[PDB]
C-alpha cells in the first residue's frame, strides 16, 4: 500500500519503504573536464551526514580570487543528488560561465529524513564554507575538513546562494536564517542569491489545474508532514500571517526567476511581499517566456541563453 | 540477443547495450563515521577519467604517519564502484583495523572501456599517490590535484597494494609493471601487496566444474576480447610461455589468499610459479576454510576474523 506515488521517480509505502526508479546517473569526480574547457570537481565530507561537490573553473592565474556559489539542488526535497548528472551537468556549466567556485550541497532527502533536515544540512554546509574565511594553506596541517580550493580561490566578499524549485525554497529559508544567525558569527556575509522557480505555496485568486492544486502542493506534506500550519507554514508560505519579515534577508542582491506556467502567479505574490517589506538591496527579475525544464537541457540554445541570463548575476 | 550472458550479473547485447544486475547503493562522503569509530572519506579527481575514494582513520596525533593502501576493487572488471556500499563498507573496515590511509581507485569498467583501460587507470592512480612523496602542505597553493591527507599522513616507506578477484589481477599486473616502470621514477617503492582470490586462468591437470571451465573464464573474454593469446595472455595467465618473470615483482612482501572452492587449484598453480621464479621477499598465504563471499559480510564474526587476518599484513 502506497501513501505517495509519482512514477517513475518516487514511490512511498505505508510501512515507510521508498522506491526511486529512473534517477539520473552518478558522475564521478574529474580533473580538467574537456566538455566545459577545464572545470574540475571533487566530493568532500562536511559532517557525518552532509557532503558537497566542490567545483573549480579552469585556473589561469594561481593568485586570482573568484566568486563563491553555494548551490542547493531542487526536485521535490525527495529526489536526485549533487553527484548525479541532472544537477551536476547544470552546475559545471554555470561554474564555467560565471568563472566561480561552486559548492553543490548533498543534503538529506525526504521522506527518509523529513524537513527540517535539508534546511539544517544546507545551513551546516554554508557555515562550513564560511569557516574558511581568512585561513591560509598552513591550516590544512591540522584541520582535516577544510578545502584547499576554497582557501586558495574563494573571494568571501562575493559569496552567492543559488537554488532551483525546492532548493530555492531552501535559499529563502537560509536567507531568513542568515539575518538572525549571522554566518561565522558575522565574519561572513552573503552578497547575493538566485531563486529560480522557487517552491512556495501561496493562495492565488486564479483557478489552478489539478496538477498545480494537488501534485505540486503534495511535495510539502511529503517533506514536512508535521509542519505547524500545514501548507501555510511560514517556511513554505513566506506571506503567512506569522511569517518572518522578508526585509530581514541576510543579503544585498537577489535574482528571482519564473517561467510561463501556473506557478508564476505564486512567485509574483512572493515578489510583491518582498517589495512591500522594504528589503534594502538590488532586486532583479528574470521572467522567462519558457517552461521550467528548458533551463536544464544543457546542449540546447534555449538552455544556454536561460543559464547565461542567471549566471550574469554572479559578479 | 546477447554476445555475453554471465548470470546473474551481466548481459551484453549484439547491439552493444549492457544490462547489469542492480548494484550496491552509492554511499556519500562522510567525516567521523560513527560505525567505524571515526573513519572519514572523500572522492577526489586524479585525471579527466580516473578518481579515487581517499580514507583516513581517526587521527589521534597530527604528526603521526600511517601506512598507505592503494586498493583496486574486484567484481569481474565489469561491476561495482569504489563509491558503492559493497566495496566501500569493506574498505572503511580495513582502514579502521590497519589504521591506514586508503586510496580506493575508481577505474573505468568493461565492456564500455575494455582492458587495458582498468590497468592503466589503476597505474595512473598509483603514480598520483606516489607523486606526493616529499611534498609539503605549501605545494597545495599551486598543485590543484594534490591531496592534503596524503601529504600530512602518508608514510611512503609503508606503501601497500590490495586487491580482490579481478582487482587482485590488477595488483599482479601493477607489480610486474612496477619492476620495469619504477613509481615516480624510482622515488617510491611498493613495500607489500595483498591478493585475495586472484582472478587468473592457469590450466589445471584435470578439467574442473562447468562454472570454472565456462562462466568463470568468460569474464576475461568480456573484459579483453582482443587479448593476444586469449585466455593464455600473460595478464590473465601469469605462467604463459611469454609471461614476464614473477621474480620481477616490484615489492618485497606478498600475502596471497584463497578460500575453499575450485579457484583454489588455480591460485595454487600461481603460488607454485611465484615460488619457482625465485622472487626475493616474504610470501605469506591466508588459506581460509570459508567461501569467497564471507569476507565482505561486514556485520559477521567470520568477516571480522577473515578481514583481521588480511589487515594484520599491513604493518
UniProtKB/Swiss-Prot annotation, chains A, B:
It holds the Pfam family Abhydrolase_3. A motif (Involved in the stabilization of the negatively charged intermediate by the formation of the oxyanion hole) lies at residues 73-75. It comes from Catharanthus roseus. Belongs to the 'GDXG' lipolytic enzyme family. Component of iboga and aspidosperma monoterpenoid indole alkaloids (MIAs, e.g. tabersonine and catharanthine) biosynthesis pathway from 19E-geissoschizine, psychoactive compounds likely to be used in the treatment of opioid dependence. Catalyzes the conversion of dehydrosecodine to tabersonine, a precursor of vindoline; this process starts with the conversion of dihydroprecondylocarpine acetate to dehydrosecodine. Disruption phenotype: Reduced accumulation of vindoline and tabersonine, increased biosynthesis of catharanthine, but normal levels of ajmalicine. Interacts with dehydroprecondylocarpine acetate synthase (DPAS). GO terms for biological process: alkaloid biosynthetic process; indole alkaloid metabolic process. Keywords: Alkaloid metabolism, Cytoplasm, Isomerase, Lyase, Nucleus. Changing residue 166 to P: Strongly reduced activity. It is an enzyme of class 5 (isomerase). Optimum pH is 9.5. GO terms for molecular function: hydrolase activity; isomerase activity; lyase activity. Changing residue 73 to A: Reduced activity but acquired ability to produce catharanthine. Expressed in leaf epidermis. Its EC number is 5.5.1.38. The active site is at 165 (proton acceptor), 261, 292 (proton donor/acceptor). This is Tabersonine synthase.
Amino acid at each position: 500500500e502506497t501513501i505517495f506515488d509519482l512514477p517513475p521517480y518516487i514511490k512511498v509505502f505505508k510501512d515507510g519503504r521508498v522506491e526511486r526508479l529512473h534517477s539520473s546517473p552518478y558522475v564521478p569526480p574529474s580533473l580538467n573536464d574537456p566538455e566545459t574547457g577545464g572545470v574540475s570537481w571533487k566530493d568532500v565530507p562536511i559532517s557525518s551526514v552532509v557532503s558537497a561537490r566542490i567545483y573549480l573553473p579552469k585556473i589561469n592565474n594561481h593568485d586570482e580570487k573568484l566568486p563563491i556559489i553555494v548551490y542547493f539542488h531542487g526536485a521535490g526535497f525527495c529526489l536526485e543528488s549533487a553527484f548525479k548528472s541532472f544537477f551536476h551537468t547544470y552546475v559545471k556549466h554555470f561554474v564555467a560561465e560565471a568563472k566561480a567556485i561552486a559548492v553543490s550541497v548533498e543534503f538529506r532527502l525526504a521522506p527518509e529524513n523529513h524537513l527540517p533536515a535539508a534546511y539544517e544540512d544546507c545551513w551546516e554546509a554554508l557555515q562550513w564554507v564560511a569557516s574558511h574565511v581568512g585561513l591560509d594553506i598552513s591550516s590544512l596541517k591540522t584541520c582535516i575538513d577544510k578545502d584547499p580550493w576554497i582557501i586558495n580561490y574563494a573571494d568571501f566578499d562575493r559569496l552567492y546562494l543559488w537554488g532551483d524549485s525546492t532548493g530555492a525554497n531552501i535559499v529563502h529559508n537560509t536567507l531568513i536564517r542568515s539575518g538572525k544567525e549571522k554566518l561565522n558569527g558575522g565574519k561572513v556575509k552573503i552578497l547575493g542569491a538566485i531563486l529560480y522557480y522557487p517552491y512556495f505555496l501561496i493562495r492565488t485568486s486564479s483557478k489552478q489545474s489539478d496538477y498545480m492544486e494537488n501534485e505540486y502542493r503534495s511535495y510539502w506534506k511529503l517533506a514536512y508532514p508535521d509542519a505547524p500550519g500545514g501548507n501555510d507554514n511560514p517556511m513554505i508560505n513566506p506571506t503567512a500571517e506569522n511569517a518572518p519579515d522578508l526585509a530581514g534577508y541576510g543579503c544585498s542582491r537577489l535574482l528571482i526567476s519564473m517561467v510561463a506556467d501556473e506557478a508564476r502567479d505564486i512567485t509574483l505574490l512572493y515578489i510583491d511581499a518582498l517589495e512591500k517589506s522594504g528589503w534594502k538591496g538590488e532586486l532583479d527579475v528574470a521572467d522567462f517566456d519558457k517552461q521550467y525544464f528548458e533551463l536544464f537541457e544543457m546542449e540546447t540554445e534555449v538552455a544556454k541563453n536561460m543559464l547565461r541570463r542567471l549566471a550574469s548575476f554572479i559578479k
